[PDB]
From Swiss-Prot:
EC main group: oxidoreductase
Protein name, per record: Aldose reductase-related protein 2
Protein species of origin: Mus musculus
Family: Belongs to the aldo/keto reductase family.
GO CC terms: cytoplasm
Keywords: Cytoplasm, NADP, Oxidoreductase
Assembly and oligomerization: Monomer.
Length: 315
């Protein structure tokens, strides 16, 4: 299907356009090319430093009458340096006014660990240690619930949360709006079977990020795992006359998981959403699921000892 039904009954387009690393100079035309290619969901974030330009694109396509606002599903996230309530309101406003929108369809806690407030996204002492803060995501959640009550955000969600962190949120006393999504890394080398089963059991959808392995991530060592070059994935793509990137995106669609490939190249943006005219067989899905390597593409070793570091839990 072309969407994943959320618990609120809102339909989240299953293929969205990722924007991390897209330069401010190139993201406006890339979002316009994606909307022309049928994309109706754009993943954004205050931390990506390009929301203003993404806003310019949406505003132009709505002004040109190519689509209405309700046809789109815009997602942004709250960076952990802004969990405190006063800072949360200021950050959300910066994200909403940069995007030039009346409301967001989905706002997510970006990472579960609160970081020191300030101008930097990664505050650090002199020895390179990333500075944390004690304000939790539960406190930040209350500020986010207010935005929903103010009609500025339709729904809330979390990102990079393990099941213990989602349980704390679902068990929060006085919880007013449940999370409708948990955005995490997911691809054939990190299949997330237990986390996806847990989220679906709670009525929480999952959005898979870095579906192509994030080849353009900072400091990627060329010898690390390459999903786009894996011959085993190329073989299955050839059986369907599709590319490896199209198989990597169709994989999530067949698990009822939203996926958000990133690209500032119009031909690839088109190629990445031409995944609705074929289906991976049951045997092909089992083979791809067997490629799991519990491999995450972008790690920060300085975050491993943090209190909310999310990767060492079972799921
Ligand atoms: N919540 C979180 O913590 C995180 C969320 N995300 C989100 O997920 C999105 C996607 O993940 P991301 O890490 O960016 O990496 P992706 O796995 O989407 O890969 C992006 C890279 O793949 C290239 N590419 C895209 N399509 C193709 C294709 N068909 N063939 C070959 N190369 C292709 C792009 O090149 P080019 O652009 O030049 O076309 C770019 O270099 C992010 O942009 C962001 O929105 C990502 C990480 C973390
Ligand atoms: O954030 C994006 O969307 C992409 C993203 N991912 N990563 C890897 C990260 N790993 C983390 C781990 C924690 C932790 F919670 F574990 F502490 C906290 C924060 C991070 S950022 C980055 O290093 C990064 C830097 C700038 C802009 C975007 C990103």
């Amino acid at each position: 299907a072309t969407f994943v039904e959320l618990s609120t009954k809102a339909k989240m387009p299953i293929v969205g356009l990722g924007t991390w690393k897209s330069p401010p100079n190139q993201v406006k035309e890339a979002v316009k090319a994606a909307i022309d290619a049928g994309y109706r969901h754009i993943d954004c974030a205050y931390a990506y430093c390009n929301e203003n330009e993404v806003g310019e694109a949406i505003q132009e396509k709505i002004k040109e009458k190519a689509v209405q606002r309700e046809d789109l599903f815009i997602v942004s996230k709250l960076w952990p340096t802004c969990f405190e309530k006063k800072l949360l309101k200021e950050a959300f406003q910066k994200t909403l006014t940069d995007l030039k929108l009346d409301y967001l369809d989905l706002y997510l806690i970006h990472w579960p660990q609160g970081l020191q407030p300030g101008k930097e996204l990664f505050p650090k002492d002199d020895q390179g240690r990333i500075l944390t803060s004690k304000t939790t995501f539960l406190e930040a959640w209350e500020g986010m619930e207010e935005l929903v009550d103010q009609g500025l955000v339709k729904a809330l969600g979390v990102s990079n949360f393990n099941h213990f962190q989602i349980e704390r949120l679902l068990n929060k006393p006085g919880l007013k709006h449940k999370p409708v999504t948990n955005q995490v890394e997911c691809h054939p080398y990190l299949t997330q079977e237990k986390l996806i089963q847990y989220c679906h059991s709670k009525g929480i959808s999952v959005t898979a990020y870095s579906p192509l392995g994030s080849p353009d991530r900072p400091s990627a060592k060329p010898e690390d795992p390459s999903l786009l070059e894996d011959p085993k994935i190329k073989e299955i793509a050839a059986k369907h006359e599709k590319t490896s990137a199209q198989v990597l995106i169709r994989f999530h669609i067949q698990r009822n998981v939203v996926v958000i490939p990133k690209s500032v190249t119009p031909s690839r943006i088109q190629e990445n959403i031409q995944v609705f005219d074929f289906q991976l067989s049951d045997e092909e899905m089992a083979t791809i699921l067997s490629f799991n390597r519990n491999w995450r593409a972008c790690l920060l070793p300085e975050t491993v000892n943090m209190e909310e570091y999310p990767y060492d839990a079972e799921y």
